[PDB]
């Protein structure tokens, strides 16, 4: 059992902070995300992250720039940005924080494409059932103008 | 695209650096 | 993309039809 | 020499209206476009087109939808939209007008990608000249911080 400096603890706490951060920015009861367990100190860290996330969300030019990348291949995008961010060989906490922020934006960009395809998939089932099982009855109503009548 | 990605990274690096 | 394109066309067709 | 109904006149007037319309929506003296020659009647038509172009520019949801298409292959996009717009086999002037409007938006979308690449091309020349011819002198100044000094 290592302290804060052990890689074990760094990866463990890193995953907790990151997940809590991305979930908080991802927020309909069906879409409720379970809280990440956090001791006091990790909690304070998450609070800090969330405030910085909110200020960064206010920079409209950053938001414009982020939305302009094509995330057809988001993994490629993620590793290019990360590599570039740290290419000069310098490190600071700001950059680590901004990297976490970029990861959360990639989740939301991925969803922006996943949700319409999810919708398309379920429409496929629904319309397929409608066509083979309900269309005959719907025709007897004179099509969807019948539903107009029904609703008055 | 490759230049759009570069632009984001360098703005993130700058945000990060300006946090200090 | 193919659905985005379809959406634009049908809005244009609708704009056009609503011009009468 | 056919009248208004001849295909000759239809294509000729069509090209004049279209070009005048797209140019007007494309508007720095270096970027000044020469007026299309128009008799009185074609002029009135162009006026009408320009007013409709302005109202359509005000529909933000249409603008959002247009900007969302990927014009990596704009010709493909153009013919898909056109085909779809007239797929039901109906025609009216509104649709023809809205098609002209879409063509003008495609010009502006193409430019949105052409301009940064034009910039990149000229930067290539400039930086290439800078690197081989000016860098030695710029180094003697201590790099671009020298220009800071120069400007005070």
Author numbering:
A (entry chain A), D (entry chain A): 10 to 36, 42 to 166
B (entry chain B), C (entry chain B): 79 to 98
Task: Tell me what the authors wrote about this structure, in their words.
To confirm that the N- and C-terminal segments of the longer peptides did not influence the peptides' interaction with Bax, we crystallised both BimBH3mini and BidBH3mini with BaxΔC26. These structures are essentially identical to that reported above and to BidBH3:BaxΔC21 (PDB 4BD27), except to note that in the case of the BimBH3mini complex, no clear density is evident for F159 (the ‘h4' residue). The BH3mini:BaxΔC26 complexes contain a cavity between helices α1, α2, α5 and α8 (shaped with the side chains of residues 26, 30, 60, 63, 66, 67, 110, 111, 114, 115, 158 and 161) as observed also in the BidBH3:BaxΔC21 complex but not in the apo BaxΔC21 core/latch dimer.
Core/latch dimers of Bax and Bak form on treatment of the monomeric proteins with certain BH3 peptides and CHAPS, and Bax and Bak core domains form symmetric homodimers, supporting that unlatching the core domain is a necessary step to Bax and Bak oligomerisation and permeabilisation of the MOM. Bim and Bid are both potent direct activators of Bax, but Bim is less dependent on interactions via its ‘h0' residues than is Bid.
